[PDB]
Design a protein around this motif. Structure first.
Motif, PDB file in Angstrom:
ATOM      1  N   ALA B 112      14.413  36.905  -4.808  1.00 57.00           N
ATOM      2  CA  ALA B 112      14.743  37.620  -6.053  1.00 57.00           C
ATOM      3  C   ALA B 112      13.519  38.349  -6.640  1.00 57.00           C
ATOM      4  O   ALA B 112      12.409  37.832  -6.581  1.00 57.00           O
ATOM      5  N   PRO B 113      13.718  39.548  -7.221  1.00 51.05           N
ATOM      6  CA  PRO B 113      12.572  40.224  -7.852  1.00 51.05           C
ATOM      7  C   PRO B 113      12.098  39.529  -9.133  1.00 51.05           C
ATOM      8  O   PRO B 113      12.881  38.861  -9.786  1.00 51.05           O
ATOM      9  N   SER B 114      10.819  39.660  -9.456  1.00 58.54           N
ATOM     10  CA  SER B 114      10.346  39.411 -10.810  1.00 58.54           C
ATOM     11  C   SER B 114      10.423  40.744 -11.522  1.00 58.54           C
ATOM     12  O   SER B 114       9.900  41.746 -11.021  1.00 58.54           O
ATOM     13  N   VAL B 115      11.073  40.756 -12.679  1.00 54.52           N
ATOM     14  CA  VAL B 115      11.309  41.991 -13.409  1.00 54.52           C
ATOM     15  C   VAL B 115      10.408  42.054 -14.635  1.00 54.52           C
ATOM     16  O   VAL B 115      10.236  41.066 -15.352  1.00 54.52           O
ATOM     17  N   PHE B 116       9.821  43.222 -14.859  1.00 55.67           N
ATOM     18  CA  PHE B 116       9.009  43.476 -16.040  1.00 55.67           C
ATOM     19  C   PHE B 116       9.354  44.859 -16.573  1.00 55.67           C
ATOM     20  O   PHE B 116       9.681  45.778 -15.799  1.00 55.67           O
ATOM     21  N   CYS B 194      16.123  47.479 -19.208  1.00 49.73           N
ATOM     22  CA  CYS B 194      16.143  47.642 -17.774  1.00 49.73           C
ATOM     23  C   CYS B 194      16.993  46.515 -17.175  1.00 49.73           C
ATOM     24  O   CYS B 194      16.612  45.351 -17.256  1.00 49.73           O
ATOM     25  N   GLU B 195      18.138  46.862 -16.586  1.00 56.11           N
ATOM     26  CA  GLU B 195      19.033  45.878 -15.956  1.00 56.11           C
ATOM     27  C   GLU B 195      19.000  45.941 -14.425  1.00 56.11           C
ATOM     28  O   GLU B 195      19.317  46.979 -13.833  1.00 56.11           O
ATOM     29  N   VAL B 196      18.635  44.837 -13.778  1.00 61.75           N
ATOM     30  CA  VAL B 196      18.575  44.861 -12.323  1.00 61.75           C
ATOM     31  C   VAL B 196      19.562  43.933 -11.599  1.00 61.75           C
ATOM     32  O   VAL B 196      19.742  42.763 -11.950  1.00 61.75           O
ATOM     33  N   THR B 197      20.202  44.497 -10.583  1.00 62.24           N
ATOM     34  CA  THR B 197      21.115  43.772  -9.724  1.00 62.24           C
ATOM     35  C   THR B 197      20.496  43.641  -8.328  1.00 62.24           C
ATOM     36  O   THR B 197      20.032  44.639  -7.744  1.00 62.24           O
ATOM     37  N   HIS B 198      20.465  42.408  -7.814  1.00 60.90           N
ATOM     38  CA  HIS B 198      19.903  42.106  -6.497  1.00 60.90           C
ATOM     39  C   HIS B 198      20.531  40.831  -5.914  1.00 60.90           C
ATOM     40  O   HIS B 198      20.806  39.873  -6.638  1.00 60.90           O
ATOM     41  N   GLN B 199      20.726  40.822  -4.599  1.00 62.71           N
ATOM     42  CA  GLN B 199      21.313  39.678  -3.878  1.00 62.71           C
ATOM     43  C   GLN B 199      20.702  38.315  -4.238  1.00 62.71           C
ATOM     44  O   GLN B 199      21.383  37.290  -4.199  1.00 62.71           O
ATOM     45  N   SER B 202      21.914  35.626  -9.074  1.00 59.54           N
ATOM     46  CA  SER B 202      23.343  35.293  -9.183  1.00 59.54           C
ATOM     47  C   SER B 202      24.014  36.126 -10.271  1.00 59.54           C
ATOM     48  O   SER B 202      25.200  36.446 -10.168  1.00 59.54           O
ATOM     49  N   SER B 203      23.240  36.464 -11.304  1.00 58.63           N
ATOM     50  CA  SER B 203      23.644  37.425 -12.325  1.00 58.63           C
ATOM     51  C   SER B 203      22.569  38.499 -12.477  1.00 58.63           C
ATOM     52  O   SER B 203      21.390  38.235 -12.225  1.00 58.63           O
TER      53      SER B 203
END
Ligand SMILES: CC(=O)N[C@@H]1[C@@H](O)[C@H](O)[C@@H](CO)O[C@H]1O
Ligand SMILES: [Cl-]
Lengths: 222, 214, 71
Positions: B112-116, B194-199, B202-203
């Motif tokens: 999963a990414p770390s988002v900033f 900033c909204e991110v979707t990634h495998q 889970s959300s």
């Protein structure tokens, strides 16, 4: 030491032409075809045509007739490719590459495009050279924090980004530039660090842009 | 013109695994098919000529086969340096053409990414333009979706993103997205999201800030 | 001779600039259709268990068949 050495990077305005040279050494120049192949950013290879340096015969894909001229100077073992009426779309790395076999020998004696030049970058744009403005990337604010620099509005590529004069390299990501609709590039460079070190350690990105002779340091304040 | 189709466009495999790359021609080219390798920022390199003849300097783990319309480049066991882009090339018909390429990338566990998210600097704001940056750090696989929201209004057409090459140590990707607005438009609104979707998530994950409270 | 809509007749191949058509060599190589091949294809020779039914011509590859024991 069979080598193909190409001329340096070029910037051109729409409508101009560019002439790329390919200097060969280490074999008999006249005994191999020269091919030209180009690659636009993030795209595949596109063959541009070929030349028989021995007879000066050429051939180009129909899409390039008129615009592409392949010439050679045998006495100095160099081949040339001239592309006229340049467009944005002509922005690419241009490669020369030799291959053996011509005329009646082509079918049976061909061993691939076996040695390639290093490539010549050609950027076609009406933009003029411009160094970046460098802006801090900091949260107003996890165990780790991200910090960065936005390297905005520059032309042409490339820009080099350093952190703490090279001392900091772990967790650094310097991203591919995007070309904005202004015609200028923009990139970001980030680093994740232990957020405990934010009080006691300073973080400075060093932004080198050779084409404009600009070298800029930005301290990123959390 | 002969059309050379390389499918799939991307192959995700592990070091030490077998790779089989496909090249299909729109019509028979007999044995007149070559294979090239290209790493990022390097010239292409010849691998195989005339379908099945390995070029000088190329290690024995590479081999080509096939004839007519169906060709295969086999890499018996992937080495770290084999993750690259591969192109086929036909020479039997005028004019010579390449396939569109197959990228072989490193398969690793989902990460999963770390988002900033980063506000525009006061410095930039002086100039009349505002850039908002969203960072997705060290994820796999490469497919990710970022969506910008300004005061919960979904954004479109005013952002750009780029992705690093696969990381040499941990095989992840990172992505940077930049939302650009005029200072006037920026100062019109409060919440930047900033909204991110990634495998690996889970959300979807949303990072945001309030202008001026930042 | 000149290509027709980019193509050369059976028994010919196209030149290295796509501008000219050149005849295949009878008994050596062939070309079956209107084409943009850069060379003619080499004729197949039959292997020892096979008889030649018809010879290679500029427009047609050799046709080989097994002798009295098909196939
Ligand atoms: C067409 C051609 O061969 N041109 C030139 C020749 O005239 C020149 O003196 C020399 C030095 O650069 O290089 C070559
Ligand atoms: Cl091509």
């Amino acid at each position: 030491q069979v080598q193909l050495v190409q001329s340096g990077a070029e910037m051109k305005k729409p409508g101009a032409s560019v002439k790329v040279s390919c200097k060969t050494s280490g074999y008999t120049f006249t005994n191999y075809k020269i091919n030209w192949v180009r690659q636009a950013p993030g795209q595949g290879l596109e063959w541009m045509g070929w030349m028989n340096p021995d007879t000066d015969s050429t051939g180009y894909p129909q899409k390039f007739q008129g615009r592409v001229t392949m010439t050679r100077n045998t006495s100095i073992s160099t081949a040339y490719m001239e592309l006229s009426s340049l467009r944005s779309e002509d922005t690419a790395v241009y490669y020369c590459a030799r291959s053996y076999g011509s005329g009646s020998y082509y079918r049976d004696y061909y061993y691939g495009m076996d040695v390639w030049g290093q490539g010549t970058t050609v950027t076609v744009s009406s933009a003029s050279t411009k160094g970046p403005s460098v802006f801090p990337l900091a949260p107003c604010s996890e165990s780790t924090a991200a910090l960065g620099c936005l390297v905005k509005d520059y032309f042409p590529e490339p820009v080099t980004v350093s952190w703490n004069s090279g001392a900091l390299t772990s967790g650094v990501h310097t991203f591919p530039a995007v070309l904005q609709s202004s015609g200028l590039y923009s990139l970001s460079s980030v680093v994740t660090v232990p957020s405990s070190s934010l009080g006691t350690k300073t973080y400075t990105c060093n932004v080198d842009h050779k084409p404009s002779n600009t070298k800029v340091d930005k301290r990123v304040e959390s | 013109e002969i059309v050379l189709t390389q499918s799939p466009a991307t192959l995700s495999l592990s070091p030490g695994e077998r790779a089989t790359l496909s090249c299909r021609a729109s019509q028979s080219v007999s044995s007149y098919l070559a294979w090239y390798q290209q790493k990022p920022g390097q010239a292409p390199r010849l691998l195989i000529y005339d379908a099945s003849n390995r070029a000088t300097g190329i290690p024995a783990r590479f081999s080509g086969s096939g004839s007519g319309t169906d060709f295969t480049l086999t890499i018996s066991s992937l080495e770290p340096e084999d993750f690259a882009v591969y192109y086929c090339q036909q020479r039997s018909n005028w004019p010579l053409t390449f396939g569109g390429g197959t990228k072989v990338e490193i398969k690793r566990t989902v990460a999963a990414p770390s988002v900033f998210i980063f506000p525009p600097s006061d410095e930039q704001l002086k100039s009349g333009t505002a850039s908002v940056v969203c960072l997705l750090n060290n994820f796999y696989p490469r497919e990710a979706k970022v969506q910008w929201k300004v005061d919960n209004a979904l954004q479109s057409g005013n952002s750009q993103e780029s992705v690093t090459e696969q990381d040499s140590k941990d095989s992840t990707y990172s992505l940077s997205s930049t939302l650009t607005l005029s200072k006037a438009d920026y100062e019109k609104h409060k919440v930047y999201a900033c909204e991110v979707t990634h495998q690996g998530l889970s959300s979807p994950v949303t990072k945001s800030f309030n202008r001026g409270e930042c | 001779s000149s290509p027709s809509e980019g193509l050369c007749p059976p028994g010919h191949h196209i030149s290295e600039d796509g501008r000219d058509c050149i005849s295949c060599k009878y008994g050596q190589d062939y070309s079956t259709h209107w084409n943009d091949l850069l060379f003619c294809l080499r004729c197949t020779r039959c292997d020892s268990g096979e008889v030649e039914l018809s010879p290679c011509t500029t427009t047609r590859n050799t046709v080989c068949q097994c002798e009295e024991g098909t196939f």
